Design a protein around this ligand. Sequence first.
Ligand SMILES: [Cl-]
Lengths: 104, 97
Amino acid sequence: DPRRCMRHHYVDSISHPLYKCSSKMVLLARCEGHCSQASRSEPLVSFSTVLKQPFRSSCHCCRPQTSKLKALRLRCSGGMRLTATYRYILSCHCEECNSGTETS
Amino acid sequence: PRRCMRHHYVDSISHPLYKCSSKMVLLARCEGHCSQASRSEPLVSFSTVLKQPFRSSCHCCRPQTSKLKALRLRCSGGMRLTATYRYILSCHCEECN
Ligand SMILES: [Cl-]
């Protein structure tokens, strides 16, 4: 299967959203693809004194499995040094939509 | 065919805490493969701008509309206990969050 959950590389320029700084081009990684598992949702039955959520669901999303934190210094007007930080995704995997993970 | 779709089925319902005679009910569920790829990419944080590590997108086959329904169970001692559930009328692909 070629369209499966996969790591893809790309480049983006990192710039501060408010301060007009010295933007920098960086190589980044993202997770992308189609998880093989179908997503589903079915009703849960409630009874007297036994209340449950209306639906029980399953859904798999292509998300980061491992990553490495990186930081880089930008140069801004006129001498300000700002650190920017982001995760460099090392591997991807399919995981439940509602998993309690940092991506959730 | 494999798209996000309504599927019908029947299930036997029993009260988990009370002795009741099971009852068969017609149910609907959502199931399928949403067309959109799911993805997750990093968010850039700065010294005073603290963000989640990732920005993600993911589509799930879930109920779009539904109807609350109810039925009377027959239980021990001529007791009638209520059970309730949502009957899914339509399905669609929706963001995980
Ligand atoms: Cl129907």
